[PDB]
Paper text:
Here, we show that Pseudomonas aeruginosa OprC is an outer membrane, TonB-dependent transporter that is conserved in many Proteobacteria and which mediates acquisition of both reduced and oxidised ionic copper via an unprecedented CxxxM-HxM metal binding site. The CxxxM-HxM configuration, which coordinates the copper in a tetrahedral manner, is highly unusual and has, to our knowledge, not been observed before in copper homeostasis proteins.
The superficial similarity of the OprC binding site to that of (pseudo)azurin prompted us to generate the M147H and M325H OprC mutants in an attempt to convert OprC into a unique, blue copper transport protein.
Author numbering: 66 to 445, 449 to 723
Amino acid sequence: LAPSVVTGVAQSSPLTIVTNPKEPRQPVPASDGADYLKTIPGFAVIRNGGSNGDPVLRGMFGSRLNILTNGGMMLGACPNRMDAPTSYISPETYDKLTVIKGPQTVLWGPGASAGTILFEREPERFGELGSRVNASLLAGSNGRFDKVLDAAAGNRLGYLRFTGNHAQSDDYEDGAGNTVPSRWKKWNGDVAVGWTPDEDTLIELTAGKGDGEARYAGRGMDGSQFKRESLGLRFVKSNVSDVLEKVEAQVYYNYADHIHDNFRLRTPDPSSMMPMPMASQVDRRTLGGRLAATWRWDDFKLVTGVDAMRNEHRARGSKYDMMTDYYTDADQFPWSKDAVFHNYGAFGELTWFAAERDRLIGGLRLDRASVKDYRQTLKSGHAMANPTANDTRADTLPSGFVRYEHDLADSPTTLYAGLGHAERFPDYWELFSPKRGPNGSVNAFDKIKPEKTTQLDFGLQYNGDKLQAWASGYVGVVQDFILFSYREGMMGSSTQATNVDARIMGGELGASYQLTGNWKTDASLAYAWGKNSSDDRALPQIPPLEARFGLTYEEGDWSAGSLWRVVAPQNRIARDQGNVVGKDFDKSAGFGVFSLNGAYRVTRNVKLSAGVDNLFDKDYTEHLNKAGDAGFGFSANETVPEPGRTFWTKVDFSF
Ligand SMILES: [Cu+]
């Protein structure tokens, strides 16, 4: 029961990873959800600056990941994804993090072709009047300071919960001694009110808000505001009849209000195409809901239900009267709506427990998706007509999967193989952000097709006594993979969205071995591969082969760890192609990074941990990081470097 620092998370059951995000993590995360995914093999992160990275799973970017918080969807507003869904999540304020790899669930929404990520808080369990406090403080290099408070009180009949955090860092340094533009601040406060009139009934109301700022080495602008407001209502009814085990009902409202500019966290670049102050303000308003029934009987479990979603995007921008040298801020103009999305779906998942060592799971959903272009004009001696103003388009998209899981007779082994098909309607960035659509189209909104993935997943679990191992591989094809291509034109850079066909394959594996009662070791490996077979070319933005080796010594109340991370070169690139955020340009160099950690339980209630990240102060960058901005002194296509040696200390309280 000795405390330790988390450097990797294993796969605990076929395709699924479950972890407590309150444990200290050894490459210390920045209070965002992308960094908490770095310890799960198969995840990589596009670095923008000090925080708010964009998560990449098995080489898949963006909405191919379905990222939920308490069952709801929080979508960002930045047309350049400065505020990806994970940038609104502070994972320490949650209780559980679940990842399901591959298109192997239908219960949580449309289009999760790459995987599903679920951040959860679990309702209190008070049986008598009482209270609960969890908290933590973290301090480290470069002004890093974090506070987290999670308190609740209640009784058999109901409860009140408050969770909040405040977190910040100054600019960090790379391993060559340069200050990287990358300071950030984040804070959140949320309340939950729970009513439990009896054991079979839970009704819970939630409301919360947060804000932040972030300096972006890899952008022409910084994020000076990331406002979030959230409202939720969920209802669980248990043991309704002998076969109706559970009924779930949930609605959520999430509002993002984002500002980026070139003068609040930097000064305007004199040699850029924005030498004058400029700010843009955008928001995203999201309303959605879910209703699901769970039936159990004989050797069968059936989960059935429907879900719905609507979201809306608006924007307004500042103006700079050159002649009088006068600046009118963006909040002096009306909001201007530009897009509305809708989705309605019906879904079901049946499970058969054949005998005791055999499981068969099948799932299906049908989705009705639609979008409307509300842009009355476009940008380009200022504006131009939008040829699809007020147009609508829609599609209906079936998805499903089958999965077989067999447990061996002799060893504690599970084998599994699964077939999944997933169809995803294009998202805001794929339709509204490209400057051009496919050749011969009027724009991207009018022509980009839905993306259709067919994938075979397979793997094994070995749950031995000294040895714990797992592996998970996948082969698939993507029809109408949505791809970005980049051109110069001496107008800045400009993008084109196209549909192409693709092959993908890869996998993750890992093991941990209890050497002695004190000594444990573990390792992991992750590989992704992709081909643009429409163009006989590699897919862009695929992270290279990556390995982790850990060693831990634990002894009563304390433990000590060492971690090695070793990353291969990525020589498979597609220059000037990528997504809405990034593009390939050069092959990447391989590297190794080394870290140490320790932990110590002082009392039942107080536990301590500390680490040194990147002990040897290695100067390195990752394949997927953004190119640095010229106005900060970055040449060429020099990508943002990773941090050099950093120290941190954490104390966890629990009462
Ligand atoms: Cu932005």
